[PDB]
Amino acid sequence: DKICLGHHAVSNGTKVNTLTERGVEVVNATETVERTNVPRICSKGKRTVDLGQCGLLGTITGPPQCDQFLEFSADLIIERREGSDVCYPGKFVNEEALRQILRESGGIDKETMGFTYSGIRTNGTTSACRRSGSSFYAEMKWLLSNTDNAAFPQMTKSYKNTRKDPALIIWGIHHSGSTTEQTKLYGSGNKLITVGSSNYQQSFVPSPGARPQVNGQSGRIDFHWLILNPNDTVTFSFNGAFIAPDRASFLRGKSMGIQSEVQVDANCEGDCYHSGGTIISNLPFQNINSRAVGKCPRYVKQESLLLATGMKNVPE
Amino acid sequence: GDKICLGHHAVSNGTKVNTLTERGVEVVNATETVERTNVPRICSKGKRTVDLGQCGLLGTITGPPQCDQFLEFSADLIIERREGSDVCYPGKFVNEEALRQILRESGGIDKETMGFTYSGIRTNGTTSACRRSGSSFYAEMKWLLSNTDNAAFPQMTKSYKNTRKDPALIIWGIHHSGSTTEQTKLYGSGNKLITVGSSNYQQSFVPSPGARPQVNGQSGRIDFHWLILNPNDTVTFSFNGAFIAPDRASFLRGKSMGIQSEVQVDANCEGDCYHSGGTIISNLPFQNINSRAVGKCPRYVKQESLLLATGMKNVPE
Amino acid sequence: KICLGHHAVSNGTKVNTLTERGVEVVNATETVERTNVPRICSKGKRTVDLGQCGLLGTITGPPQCDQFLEFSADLIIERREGSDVCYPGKFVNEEALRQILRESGGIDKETMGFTYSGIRTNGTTSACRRSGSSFYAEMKWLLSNTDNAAFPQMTKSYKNTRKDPALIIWGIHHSGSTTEQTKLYGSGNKLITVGSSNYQQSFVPSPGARPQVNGQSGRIDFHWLILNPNDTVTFSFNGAFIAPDRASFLRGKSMGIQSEVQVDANCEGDCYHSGGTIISNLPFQNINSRAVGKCPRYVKQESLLLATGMKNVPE
Amino acid sequence: GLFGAIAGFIENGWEGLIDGWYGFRHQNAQGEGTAADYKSTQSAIDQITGKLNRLIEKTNQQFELIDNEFTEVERQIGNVINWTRDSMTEVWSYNAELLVAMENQHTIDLADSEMNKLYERVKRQLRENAEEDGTGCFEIFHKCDDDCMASIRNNTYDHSKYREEAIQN
Amino acid sequence: GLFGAIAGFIENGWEGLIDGWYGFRHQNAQGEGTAADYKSTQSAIDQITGKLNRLIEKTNQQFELIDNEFTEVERQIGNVINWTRDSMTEVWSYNAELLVAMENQHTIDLADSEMNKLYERVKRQLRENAEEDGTGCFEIFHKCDDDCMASIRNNTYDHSKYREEAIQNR
Amino acid sequence: GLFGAIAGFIENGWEGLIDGWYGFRHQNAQGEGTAADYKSTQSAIDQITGKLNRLIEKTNQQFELIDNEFTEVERQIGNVINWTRDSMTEVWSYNAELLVAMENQHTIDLADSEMNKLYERVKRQLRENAEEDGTGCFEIFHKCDDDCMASIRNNTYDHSKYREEAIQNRI
Numbered sequence A: 001d002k003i004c005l006g007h008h009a010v011s012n013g014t015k016v017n018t019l020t021e022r023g024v025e026v027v028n029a030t031e032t033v034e035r036t037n038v039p040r041i042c043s044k045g046k047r048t049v050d051l052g053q054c055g056l057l058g059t060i061t062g063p064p065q066c067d068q069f070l071e072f073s074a075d076l077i078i079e080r081r082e083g084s085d086v087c088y089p090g091k092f093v094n095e096e097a098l099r100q101i102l103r104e105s106g107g108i109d110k111e112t113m114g115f116t117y118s119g120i121r122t123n124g125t126t127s128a129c130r131r132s133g134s135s136f137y138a139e140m141k142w143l144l145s146n147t148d149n150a151a152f153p154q155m156t157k158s159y160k161n162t163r164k165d166p167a168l169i170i171w172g173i174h175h176s177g178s179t180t181e182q183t184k185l186y187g188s189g190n191k192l193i194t195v196g197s198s199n200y201q202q203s204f205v206p207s208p209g210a211r212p213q214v215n216g217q218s219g220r221i222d223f224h225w226l227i228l229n230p231n232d233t234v235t236f237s238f239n240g241a242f243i244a245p246d247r248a249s250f251l252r253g254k255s256m257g258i259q260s261e262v263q264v265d266a267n268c269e270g271d272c273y274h275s276g277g278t279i280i281s282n283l284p285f286q287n288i289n290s291r292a293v294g295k296c297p298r299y300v301k302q303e304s305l306l307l308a309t310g311m312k313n314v315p316e
Numbered sequence B: 001g002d003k004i005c006l007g008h009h010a011v012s013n014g015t016k017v018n019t020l021t022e023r024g025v026e027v028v029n030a031t032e033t034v035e036r037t038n039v040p041r042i043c044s045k046g047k048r049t050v051d052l053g054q055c056g057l058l059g060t061i062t063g064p065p066q067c068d069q070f071l072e073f074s075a076d077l078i079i080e081r082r083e084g085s086d087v088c089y090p091g092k093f094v095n096e097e098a099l100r101q102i103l104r105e106s107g108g109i110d111k112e113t114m115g116f117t118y119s120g121i122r123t124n125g126t127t128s129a130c131r132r133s134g135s136s137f138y139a140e141m142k143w144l145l146s147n148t149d150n151a152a153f154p155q156m157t158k159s160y161k162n163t164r165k166d167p168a169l170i171i172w173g174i175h176h177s178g179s180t181t182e183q184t185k186l187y188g189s190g191n192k193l194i195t196v197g198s199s200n201y202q203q204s205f206v207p208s209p210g211a212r213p214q215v216n217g218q219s220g221r222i223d224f225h226w227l228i229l230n231p232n233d234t235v236t237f238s239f240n241g242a243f244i245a246p247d248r249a250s251f252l253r254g255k256s257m258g259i260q261s262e263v264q265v266d267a268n269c270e271g272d273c274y275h276s277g278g279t280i281i282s283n284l285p286f287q288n289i290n291s292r293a294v295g296k297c298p299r300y301v302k303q304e305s306l307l308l309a310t311g312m313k314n315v316p317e
Numbered sequence C: 001k002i003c004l005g006h007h008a009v010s011n012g013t014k015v016n017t018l019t020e021r022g023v024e025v026v027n028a029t030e031t032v033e034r035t036n037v038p039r040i041c042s043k044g045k046r047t048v049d050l051g052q053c054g055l056l057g058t059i060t061g062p063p064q065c066d067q068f069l070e071f072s073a074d075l076i077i078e079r080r081e082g083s084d085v086c087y088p089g090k091f092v093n094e095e096a097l098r099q100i101l102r103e104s105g106g107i108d109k110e111t112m113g114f115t116y117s118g119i120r121t122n123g124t125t126s127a128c129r130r131s132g133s134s135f136y137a138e139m140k141w142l143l144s145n146t147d148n149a150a151f152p153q154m155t156k157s158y159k160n161t162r163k164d165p166a167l168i169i170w171g172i173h174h175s176g177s178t179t180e181q182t183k184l185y186g187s188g189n190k191l192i193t194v195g196s197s198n199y200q201q202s203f204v205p206s207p208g209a210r211p212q213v214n215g216q217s218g219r220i221d222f223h224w225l226i227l228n229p230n231d232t233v234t235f236s237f238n239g240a241f242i243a244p245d246r247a248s249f250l251r252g253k254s255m256g257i258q259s260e261v262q263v264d265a266n267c268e269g270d271c272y273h274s275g276g277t278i279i280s281n282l283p284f285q286n287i288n289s290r291a292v293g294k295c296p297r298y299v300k301q302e303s304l305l306l307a308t309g310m311k312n313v314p315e
Numbered sequence D: 001g002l003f004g005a006i007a008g009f010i011e012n013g014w015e016g017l018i019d020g021w022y023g024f025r026h027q028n029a030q031g032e033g034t035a036a037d038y039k040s041t042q043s044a045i046d047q048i049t050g051k052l053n054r055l056i057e058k059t060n061q062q063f064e065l066i067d068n069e070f071t072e073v074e075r076q077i078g079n080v081i082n083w084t085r086d087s088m089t090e091v092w093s094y095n096a097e098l099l100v101a102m103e104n105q106h107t108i109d110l111a112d113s114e115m116n117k118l119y120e121r122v123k124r125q126l127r128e129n130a131e132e133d134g135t136g137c138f139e140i141f142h143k144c145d146d147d148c149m150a151s152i153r154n155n156t157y158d159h160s161k162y163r164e165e166a167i168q169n
Numbered sequence E: 001g002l003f004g005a006i007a008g009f010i011e012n013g014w015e016g017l018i019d020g021w022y023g024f025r026h027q028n029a030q031g032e033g034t035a036a037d038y039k040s041t042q043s044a045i046d047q048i049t050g051k052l053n054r055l056i057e058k059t060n061q062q063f064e065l066i067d068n069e070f071t072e073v074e075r076q077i078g079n080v081i082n083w084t085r086d087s088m089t090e091v092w093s094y095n096a097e098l099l100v101a102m103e104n105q106h107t108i109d110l111a112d113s114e115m116n117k118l119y120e121r122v123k124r125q126l127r128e129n130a131e132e133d134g135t136g137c138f139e140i141f142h143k144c145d146d147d148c149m150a151s152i153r154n155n156t157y158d159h160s161k162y163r164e165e166a167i168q169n170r
Numbered sequence F: 001g002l003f004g005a006i007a008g009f010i011e012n013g014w015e016g017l018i019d020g021w022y023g024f025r026h027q028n029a030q031g032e033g034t035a036a037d038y039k040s041t042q043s044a045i046d047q048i049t050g051k052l053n054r055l056i057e058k059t060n061q062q063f064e065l066i067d068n069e070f071t072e073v074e075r076q077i078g079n080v081i082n083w084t085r086d087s088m089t090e091v092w093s094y095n096a097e098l099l100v101a102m103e104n105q106h107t108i109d110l111a112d113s114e115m116n117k118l119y120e121r122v123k124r125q126l127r128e129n130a131e132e133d134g135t136g137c138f139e140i141f142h143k144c145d146d147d148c149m150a151s152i153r154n155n156t157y158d159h160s161k162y163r164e165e166a167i168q169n170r171i
Ligand SMILES: CC(=O)N[C@@H]1[C@@H](O)[C@H](O[C@@H]2O[C@H](CO)[C@H](O)[C@H](O[C@]3(C(=O)O)C[C@H](O)[C@@H](NC(C)=O)[C@H]([C@H](O)[C@H](O)CO)O3)[C@H]2O)[C@@H](CO)O[C@H]1O
Pocket: A124, A125, A126, A127, A128, A134, A142, A144, A175, A176, A177, A181, A185, A216, A217, A218, A219, A220
């Protein structure tokens, strides 16, 4: 008598939204927003350097924490919350920029600057950088007068980047703990330090004077920096309070940097990272962390957004 | 035979919308999508409001006369006026806009003493620039002086530990005297210095005494500097003059929004989207009133109107 | 029998849909501009190509910029060989300043009406060559009357009495030695302060040893500010001060671009980038993500075809 | 115009139909009548309301000043803030105009479709007892009274109860 | 809902049709049967998979920290970065919810359409030998056996082969 | 794809139809003919042009350098600018590809629909004098000459004229 056509259905479907109706039941649907985190840095197949006690900026100047990091290579660089840039109390000026550069460096390669010195001390140290006795920043030299009180000479060290790539250059200004602490180290008289290239002009005066002790020192050493272009030349001129670079730093390639609080795992694999782990997913969006970095799903406010993968569902 | 016929409604004048495929196609009913109507008032109903008027937001921290009634406020909504003013004695806040930005969402401020006490110096320095029945000074600060004109200010160390659960806002001032001898007269001869440290903060300050024009009849300048002190951390101040010391620290109370306005407050209408020329009240997804509105707003767009069709294509004869 | 049907072609083109990749339709058309014009299409725009003159130059006036002290422009082109400076020094806060100048519509100079008593006004340098040492054309190097003599505590002030904001510049001279300084402006700690109603700042020279650039160890560093209609700048100082002679008023509106290509007054475009003009009606473009002007939106994709015909079905 | 009913094979709409969107107008022995269809009207309206509920939406997202109208922020960061704001304005304007064009295209077609759904349901009802003339009418091939009309409307018209008379035509 | 088949003139769906999306259920002299249509099912599935492949997409675009969780960046630039980030979050959330609503609307309608395409093809097949009853059935006006059913399914049913009989029954 | 005409029950398209998008091809006593339908072609074309006019649009919005290609800006603000620009590039690329996929889906379905609108209008015209064979043809059940064809085309074919003949021709 009769032939009839028809479509399938199921006893429990799932609610999606449409242009026109909320919570319309379809037969099958699928999630579009990643909510699942992996509480580990999934590092498989990436050259990894977990800095631990060493602060990223440390890798440039070289406090004891960073000795094992003066010349690394990396695809992925991990800063820890207990990282530390500094042995002798002081700061990097314009630090976050520097960090941003270093994070994508692909690592660093040191080269001597070929400075040599005459009629001055080179070997100044501090009990603040402990290495079997007072030591100092491994990449730097504390330049001193020859004897207490004696007059530091008006010096000029210059350095030409003869490599194909930009050089990262660092120096330091020493702020002594007193005016006489200064004059005892570098001689009496108003001190000055200037640093020039073709894109860089700036001068520095030390500010000797009373500070609280940090790590038992009232002095401060503050680091300044610049990118030297292929074929351009830095000149340093000075007459004291100067912490000279021994080596320049060249960046190796490409890397990403992240800050994390979780263990590394060389067994899982992801490109999207945040302080509490890796987001592994194909889904277009994610509701885990708005500050994830890497190649990520796009972060969204919504916790769930279901995409219909079947027809209107219609039960008996 | 007979006939039955189905059909759909229409109207004599419809309204033009746009589609993917045609411009100005007439449909039966349509509705607006872009808010154009402003309310020329700050609709403040049910929000704790502080209209600062003559007091500048940074004022509330240091405390010139114009801000006395604002040293310790609470607010959901904070309104800066164009005639706000931060300062009695001529000077500036360094890094001011950040400071404002913090203060705007403070939810208001709660002051606590820092428990500094002093020995062998003057504490009560004043100025005719901060008028309060005679020379006064910044209500939250203390101008630290030498004991007698010319006398050598001592090398001092005042420290303070945030023992509260929340971050402290800490302020100090550097006094730039009108002459080198104005300086030496106040704090004694000799190169002066001021340093301020915590665990995230290291910085030093030298006064720059010397000739400036008078503002409010003073050639000196007092410049304010600031920092957020973390729970448990400790500020140390060391100094031998030219230092305007904080008496109280400032703790932020909670959450608030801040706005800048040129219109009256109205506790009777209710809105969450604000701009210098009033409140945008609307449910509509977009708005063409002011691209710098703040709060919870419709999204600002270039178009003045975008009509959404709410009926069928319309056909007369 | 009668039959209806639709057209087709033997080769159609592949587009993407919501539902299928590479589905063949009859005709389709491109949506992403890939074609560059390797020239600055300047037709009908008042154009100033700065060449050897650096944009900031136009304000202070080294020799490179003499022909640019007072220009008008709709379109301003900086060159890679432009140069702000004759005597070695820098502009502090330069990029902001550039950004302002680029949209200035050009500049109009007015005297500030400073006159001076009991000091030298005519200080010069072999670093700004103009048939003999000259100096920055808009500035004056203020000196002491004789080597070693004590520069007086001076106050020059200036009120912007025009309807529009004024651009004000000055200079601090950092001598090559402490004695170079004292020789020029007398012994003693020097200071320079500059105030208005939105501006308060002071400056100390830092005399001392630097390498020579252009055979000079000194440095002159320029500082700036926008003076509001009716407001007043005061300069107070006792040396190491390079005084403005003229103020600068902005003329109107302009765009600025940086370029490495020739100008062409024959083609016409509003979207520019260092390697030319993007001429196109298409909504998006894949040529240069840093184009400026009125441009198609930059996209990652090289091509996105839009179908302009039906699903194509060949026999 | 995607389903070809409204402004399609139906010639136009009925200004004198105040009580609905879709309806029936008949002619027979007793007289002429006009009365709206509730279920297909309610259906369309329900979809258009569905749209409105989704679009007349409140963003719970708070934004603050990064800016200052009274004293201007330093010019450089000033210009960055402006270029970003201008960048968002481009996006939102593009979004707004798109959402609206597309919504409308869909609303319009939505309505066309419901009409064409009403038509085809009646056509199905009448089986073999009527004919599509092709302007949105059904010529009935049997005498059919005003209770026969109201039986079509509320979907009861029994076809085989008039099949014979009509078929012989 | 757009083509008026699913939840339209078809009353509902068949929970006991496990082997496809669209299908035939018949009644005749020999007995009753249920067997799915492959080509229309495959057609829908193929479109839905087409969607998924487009959306379960990976962005090859790398972003870096401009930000610092351990020591906070200076507040002013801090606040600009946040205002931008929050600005993008608004855009992407709007985009995501729109794309999903629109896709679904389209998927649902996609499915309605295929049903209604199956129906109309059969109706075309049977020419004048059957009648639309109007709940997605064809009343056949001639005796038609279980090899006659399987000739409809795989599209072979020759109409004029039973034409005269059925036209007589009508 | 959506209305099931093009690549649906019509088997394919006619490469030898140069003068339009949709058309009629007939067979009768006098001979065979091919001639396009203007009004349905114009209708589609008009909708595709409508699209193009909306999309080939010029943004009147001016943007300026915040950047500097000759001397680089300080690195920090440098990186913020880049991160935002890269952010916008993500949005626009997503938008562009979406708009295009969607437009095309709609254009294709647009065309399917117009075919299927033509078909159904003719079917309506012929009332009871012809039959759907089901490949986009109408088998006429009465002799019909080349002026009878041209009366269908320009929509004049009077059905009840040849109705009696055709109906009993079907029975
Ligand atoms: C008031 C008094 O007598 N205090 C004594 C003091 O003799 C001494 O403490 C020394 O204090 C000096 C400066 O006052 C330094 O702080 C000494 O530490 C070192 C350091 O490790 O850094 C020694 C180091 O080798 C020095 N390097 C130099 C000079 O190049 C540094 C350096 O000068 C400063 O860091 C620069 O600011 O100082 C510190 O031992 C001890 C006994 O010797 O006991 C105090 O009570």
